[PDB]
Write a protein that binds this ligand. Structure first.
Ligand SMILES: Cc1cn([C@H]2C[C@H](O)[C@@H](COP(=O)(O)OP(=O)(O)O)O2)c(=O)[nH]c1=O
Ligand SMILES: Cc1cn([C@H]2C[C@H](O)[C@@H](COP(=O)(O)OP(=O)(O)O)O2)c(=O)[nH]c1=O
Lengths: 356, 356
């Protein structure tokens, strides 16, 4: 019987993929508490998990566009220092969370910390209290250059603990299918995509024409209205998964739909290359048209395109018809979904955590 | 990899205790879908689970106060036929759910049905499709007289399938601690008590006086305001767990608080003998003052009072001071909580289900 403090990010993409393992721990009789930014409250509790805020409402651009000195930062065009730039963003994110995250850790007294790769507040809190921690990957590929830059940015905070680098996690979890990737344990990606009123009625009824899902995530929407009007002309019934506030002919519906709920009713997905969106579409064996927006998802879209599970489009109307006609995309997507199903479940991983 | 259709009731007390096992299944990589009345949507999805309505908004009194003939029914004062009366209520509840629950089962095609003891729509749907089903108990004691009456009321519906009684479930789950009770597998009761914005701040900070939790559930509130004003005079800081719409001196707070989140910050609980409330307080080793309102929870309050884990009050101010001064109540409550922790987890049960 353990008390596990789960430390998450400031947007849905950094919180949702930690939900299945958190519930897997709770299912094993353990006490779980998810600590994240105050704006991630409804997301955490909407997943049925206990929540505690570590900082006010916060989004990544606030932290990424300003450094410790207080000076505005800009993004390098060169991919490599762009990744280091992003990494330092995650590092400074820790400076906003650590205080309340530590004080919460002092009082709640956890035995173990669960967190994602770029949420470095986890390792910091774990190292501060002198307790082990678990690292779970939430990406097809996690560029270590991002992580290293974040650790380097936190150097004054580690020296405060008389450290150079965070102590290695008790378990490093990876979710990339072996037939894709270029001290880690593999885990099957069980997708959690948020909270809806109910599973849409059209999901259960029969489908008499190819259905396409169009989604850009929770950050990229703020092109979507253009692809919505044109894609049906390619011979598709389209559904747009987007925020209800953000939410038409040939379109079936437009609104907040957890992908895992609607994926069985779809044949192809056009998206922004989002980590959670990609892995979810992968796990359900659906060919994807990935339009990689954010730099940190670039590697994942490369692994995806290479395996032929989908088409990376750095035109997207052309990529769909290319999938609508060629069947090798569906085949690979299903092959990889089948491969992920063989991997250990979050339930299997809980035992490993308990056992060592 | 299975598709499990979870069939629940029409009020929170019949839905919430099915959440942990449902997530335990989802954690093991299985596909889960919770089917309940339309008013139980927010409860299901608030737990992070997929939802599908089997009937419009519905509460137990509608079904219990009217029979198949369409005639108004009254409650017997004699406990025994009162239990049979209640049982026939659950039986007629099936008549309201079975249609949409069946059609949903035809299209979604589940391999297995998960349900509670008195949700007979589960067994009916399972028997109709010819698939196994799982019975989980959500009570300290489940009077078989209730269940038998429900089955008897459904006799025309079983004869429709050429049956007399529902086929025995693949697994019958019980949650009563061995040192309490008078083809079942024991499972530890992992409490899920709903959805809140966050864990209250006072839960983590230190407590310099005995704190009491006052809650009557989701049905009984519609006395609570009286016990709220008087109980602090007994030397207590009181917190009232009740609907926010329903929600003062000596009172710390009043509103919707999932018990499992606030239980560590409490010393004693006064309640309506609610099944979920009792089991949750039990699992956290907290002495209870049970005021049994509903007839079906009477047996549970008897098992509770006998074990000395609390005081059954069929005056409640006296029962608290009796617990506030005598320490044998806390001892038994903790002994039973310790006993439940030894029992197999919902995660352990998932394996059993997978294995046989
Ligand atoms: C807007 C929206 C998001 N989602 C989910 C899918 C993913 O799990 C998550 C999006 O995360 P992600 O795919 O990483 O993209 P991003 O981080 O840029 O937002 O939210 C839906 O399921 N339906 C929707 O309508
Ligand atoms: C109103 C309320 C209910 N609950 C929970 C506790 C139980 O899990 C459930 C109540 O179910 P239960 O104890 O069976 O009582 P009833 O069926 O009469 O409603 O709801 C809270 O945790 N906090 C609250 O403020």
């Amino acid at each position: 019987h353990m008390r596990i403090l789960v430390i998450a990010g400031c947007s849905e993409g950094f919180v949702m993929p930690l939900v299945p393992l958190s519930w897997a721990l709770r299912a094993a009789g353990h006490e779980v508490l998810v600590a994240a930014s105050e704006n991630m409250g409804p997301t955490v509790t909407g997943a049925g998990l206990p929540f505690a805020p570590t900082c006010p409402s916060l989004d990544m651009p606030e932290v990424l566009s300003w450094d410790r000195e207080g000076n505005r930062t800009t993004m390098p065009r060169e991919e490599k220092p762009l990744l280091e730039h992003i990494g330092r963003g995650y590092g400074r994110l820790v400076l906003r969370m650590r205080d309340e995250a530590l004080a919460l850790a002092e009082r709640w007294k956890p035995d173990l910390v669960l967190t994602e790769t770029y949420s470095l507040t986890g390792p910091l809190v774990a190292a501060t209290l002198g307790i082990p921690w678990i690292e779970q990957s939430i990406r097809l590929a996690s560029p270590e250059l991002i992580k290293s830059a974040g650790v380097g940015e936190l150097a004054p905070e580690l020296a405060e603990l008389g450290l150079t680098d965070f102590p290695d996690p008790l378990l490093s979890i990876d979710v990339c299918p072996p037939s894709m990737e270029a001290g880690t344990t593999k885990m099957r990606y069980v997708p959690y995509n948020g909270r809806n009123d109910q599973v849409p009625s059209w999901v259960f009824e029969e489908r008499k024409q190819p259905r396409l899902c169009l989604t850009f995530g929770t950050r990229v929407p703020l092109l979507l209205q253009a692809l919505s009007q044109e894609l049906p002309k390619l011979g598709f019934e389209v559904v747009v998964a987007v925020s209800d506030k953000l939410a038409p002919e040939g379109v079936l519906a437009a609104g907040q739909f957890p992908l895992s709920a609607i994926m069985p009713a779809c044949d192809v997905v056009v998206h922004h290359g989002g980590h959670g969106t990609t892995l979810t579409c992968l796990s359900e064996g659906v060919p994807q048209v990935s339009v990689p927006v954010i730099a940190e998802v670039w590697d994942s879209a490369r692994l995806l395109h290479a395996a032929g599970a989908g088409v990376e489009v750095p035109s997207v109307l052309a990529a769909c018809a290319r999938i609508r006609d060629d069947s090798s995309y569906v085949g690979n997507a299903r092959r990889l979904a089948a491969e992920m199903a063989t991997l250990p479940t979050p339930a299997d991983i809980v035992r490993l955590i308990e056992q060592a």
